Amino acid sequence: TQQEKEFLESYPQNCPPDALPGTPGNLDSAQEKALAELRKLLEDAGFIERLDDSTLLRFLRARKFDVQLAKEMFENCEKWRKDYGTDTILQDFHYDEKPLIAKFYPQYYHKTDKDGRPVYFEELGAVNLHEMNKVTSEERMLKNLVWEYESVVQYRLPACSRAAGHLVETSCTIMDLKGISISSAYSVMSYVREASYISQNYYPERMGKFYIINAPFGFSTAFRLFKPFLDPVTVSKIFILGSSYQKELLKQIPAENLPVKFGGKSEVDESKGGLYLSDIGPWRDPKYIGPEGEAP
Ligand SMILES: COC(=O)[C@@H]1C[C@H]2c3ccc([N+](=O)[O-])c4c3[C@H](C[C@@H]2N(C)C1)CN4C(=O)OCC(Cl)(Cl)Cl
């Protein structure tokens, strides 16, 4: 439609030249041929939405540029979007529980990284599902996850792209394991498995950086010993850190963007919900909000 054209022209469209190959603005002739092919197949099948360069190149990158497999992945995602109701979830779903249960599984976005990525915080080690299940269900926790993802697509990434001066496609995740136990790890395992399935199949190439902090000794030790056998791309994206994580985070996230509790300088009003109920970032700055309007 013409409104989506205005939306896609409302923010920078190119990744920086030193980003990964196959990203927007950094295609060779082979990759460019694959995008046009993939696009032709999907139009011929009757798809109209989500055929912009950024979306298609993400599915291509997830399947090593195999057009047929990327089309299959796109078709699986679109089927889920119809069954789950994802295209209207921002209107349909209302997580009014959140103020009651946020402290039992803290999840919040807060500002951006040095590359413009919105930073997502998950205090998994604090999880208390026994108390969380008094108020809400796992199905509603997953709806809230998809709601956030959709809010990242529609609102946070376009604002982050404008604030950074280049296309921003991905998040930066900080997962805090402080307080995790074997018991609580098993309790959250079903949720995490569902979340990962959704992320990997329906949001490919949206993970930019993933930091685990306060990892227990045995978990941390395994990654240290197997890091040499891991893809150097993987090693640049995924970090398993112990209790001295502050300096590593500050290399990735400006001090004024990183919350105090994690070694930064960024502060929020603890009397008005604190970080758990906050959603601070460029997507709340009118200078960086385009025709999509401001996020809910
Ligand atoms: C619209 O896009 C968004 O809103 C992003 C998408 C989301 C995401 C996409 C894909 C994967 N993924 O491909 O797997 C993945 C995530 C998780 C974190 C990301 N953001 C917090 C939100 C982490 N994540 C994952 O599963 O974590 C396990 C590993 Cl493999 Cl990193 Cl240890």
Curated annotation (Swiss-Prot):
GO biological process, one term: phospholipid transport
Claim: Phosphoprotein is one of the keywords in the record: yes
Keyword terms, alphabetized: Cytoplasm, Golgi apparatus, Isopeptide bond, Membrane, Phosphoprotein, Protein transport, Transport, Ubl conjugation
Membrane topology according to the record: Peripheral membrane protein
Gene Ontology cellular-component annotations: cytoplasm; cytosol; Golgi apparatus; Golgi membrane
Cystine bridges: none
Pfam families linked: CRAL_TRIO, CRAL_TRIO_N
Localization terms from the record: Golgi apparatus membrane; Cytoplasm
This protein's record includes keyword Cytoplasm: yes
Regulation of its activity: The inhibitor activity of SEC14 is controlled by whether PI or PC is bound to SEC14. The pPC-bound form of SEC14 is an inhibitor, while the PI-bound form is not. The phospholipid binding/exchange activity of SEC14 represents a mechanism by which the regulatory activity of SEC14 is itself controlled.
Domain of life of the organism encoding this protein: Eukaryota
CRAL-TRIO domain mapped to chain residues: 97-270
Annotated crosslink Glycyl lysine isopeptide (Lys-Gly) (interchain with G-Cter in ubiquitin) location: 40, 82
Consequence the record notes for mutating residue 237 to A: Inactivates phosphatidylinositol, but not phosphatidylcholine, transfer activity, but rescues the lethality and Golgi secretory defects associated with sec14 null mutations
Reaction catalyzed: a 1,2-diacyl-sn-glycero-3-phospho-(1D-myo-inositol)(in) = a 1,2-diacyl-sn-glycero-3-phospho-(1D-myo-inositol)(out); a 1,2-diacyl-sn-glycero-3-phosphocholine(in) = a 1,2-diacyl-sn-glycero-3-phosphocholine(out)
InterPro entries in UniProt: CRAL-TRIO_dom, CRAL-TRIO_dom_sf, CRAL/TRIO_N_dom, CRAL/TRIO_N_dom_sf, PI/PC_transfer
Gene Ontology molecular-function annotations: phosphatidylcholine transporter activity; phosphatidylinositol transfer activity
PANTHER family tied to this protein: CRAL-TRIO DOMAIN-CONTAINING PROTEIN YKL091C-RELATED
Stated role: Required for transport of secretory proteins from the Golgi complex. Catalyzes the transfer of phosphatidylinositol (PI) and phosphatidylcholine (PC) between membranes in vitro. Essential for viability and secretion. Exchanges its bound phospholipid with phospholipid monomers that reside in membrane bilayers. Regulates specific trans-Golgi export pathways, like transport from endosomes to the trans-Golgi or transport from the plasma membrane to the vacuole at the level of the endosome.
Miscellaneous remark of the record: Present with 84300 molecules/cell in log phase SD medium.
Stated name of the protein: SEC14 cytosolic factor
